[PDB]
Amino acid sequence: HHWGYGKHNGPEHWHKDFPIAKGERQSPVDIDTHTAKYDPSLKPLSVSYDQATSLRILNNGHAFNVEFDDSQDKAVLKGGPLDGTYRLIQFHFHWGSLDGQGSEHTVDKKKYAAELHLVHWNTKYGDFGKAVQQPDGLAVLGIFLKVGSAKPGLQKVVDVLDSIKTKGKSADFTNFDPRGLLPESLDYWTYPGSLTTPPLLECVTWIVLKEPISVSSEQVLKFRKLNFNGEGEPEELMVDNWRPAQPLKNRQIKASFK
Ligand SMILES: CNS(=O)(=O)c1c(F)c(F)c(SCCO)c(F)c1F
Numbered sequence: 001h002h003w004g005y006g007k008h009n010g011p012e013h014w015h016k017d018f019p020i021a022k023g024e025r026q027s028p029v030d031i032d033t034h035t036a037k038y039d040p041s042l043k044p045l046s047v048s049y050d051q052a053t054s055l056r057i058l059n060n061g062h063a064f065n066v067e068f069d070d071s072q073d074k075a076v077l078k079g080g081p082l083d084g085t086y087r088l089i090q091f092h093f094h095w096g097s098l099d100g101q102g103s104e105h106t107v108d109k110k111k112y113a114a115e116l117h118l119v120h121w122n123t124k125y126g127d128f129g130k131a132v133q134q135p136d137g138l139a140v141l142g143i144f145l146k147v148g149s150a151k152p153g154l155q156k157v158v159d160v161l162d163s164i165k166t167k168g169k170s171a172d173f174t175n176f177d178p179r180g181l182l183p184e185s186l187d188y189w190t191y192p193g194s195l196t197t198p199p200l201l202e203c204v205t206w207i208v209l210k211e212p213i214s215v216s217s218e219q220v221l222k223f224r225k226l227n228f229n230g231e232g233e234p235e236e237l238m239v240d241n242w243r244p245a246q247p248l249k250n251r252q253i254k255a256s257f258k
């Protein structure tokens with residue numbers, strides 16, 4: 001009876017195994033754009049993805065995950081609200097059963113069809129597993145997806161999904177360039193928060209871009225053909241693998257713009 005996204009093991013259940021679910025800095029949150037504080041001391045985000053090395057794509061039963069070689073400073077995030085250097089380890093998405101839902105963060109209560117998370121770990125902690133035990137261990141870049149025109153830079157990912165349909169499948173996935181998933185503007189909101197799946201650790205500096213990318217209906221439809229179950233276990237479509245917004249508590253969301 002492990003955690004998942006259903007009636008009996010979904011987000012409202014998670015606190016029984018992971019009591020930090022009700023903690024002081026949980027994610028996602030609603031971004032109320034009118035109360036976010038402009039901070040003119042926030043630096044432009046530095047996203048340096050030229051040397052990224054993707055390795056593999058994996059269905060873990062919760063999402064699909066594009067993993068990168070993080071054994072050197074290739075693809076890194078710095079600047080913005082960050083002190084020091086954070087290394088890209090992987091990305092993944094959360095999405096809906098319908099185009100009207102699927103994002104984790106919301107903007108003035110608006111849900112997007114999906115949300116991309118590019119996960120990076122602070123190189124002061126030497127690897128990802130040590131970094132998640134620290135208050136400033138991760139920086140997650142979150143990008144919203146709306147359904148409209150196709151994102152051409154997403155298509156390589158979409159086309160390999162049928163090869164990892166079920167829980168525990170991987171595939172080699174080399175030479176994927178994550179710059180193809182970024183919108184034009186790096187204007188962002190930032191706040192202190194957590195992982196959005198168990199173990200829900202409060203180790204994340206969240207950076208959420210204001211500008212969504214658009215993807216086509218066909219591209220998100222293909223995300224919804226994945227399965228939460230393993231091969232030869234009964235079919236459960238991988239849809240609605242998002243956690244709802246959690247109480248902001250004693251936090252202020254900062255804006256890099258306007
Ligand atoms: C914020 N999204 S999340 O909690 O679902 C999530 C995730 F799915 C990940 F896979 C990783 S990195 C796994 C190590 O490679 C991570 F840091 C995350 F925060």
Ligand code: NA
Nearest residue numbers: 159160161162
């Ligand atoms: Na395919």
Ligand code: NA
Nearest residue numbers: 148216217218
């Ligand atoms: Na369409």
Ligand code: NA
Nearest residue numbers: 231232233234
């Ligand atoms: Na079977």
Ligand SMILES: [Zn+2]
Nearest residue numbers: 092094117196
């Ligand atoms: Zn995520």
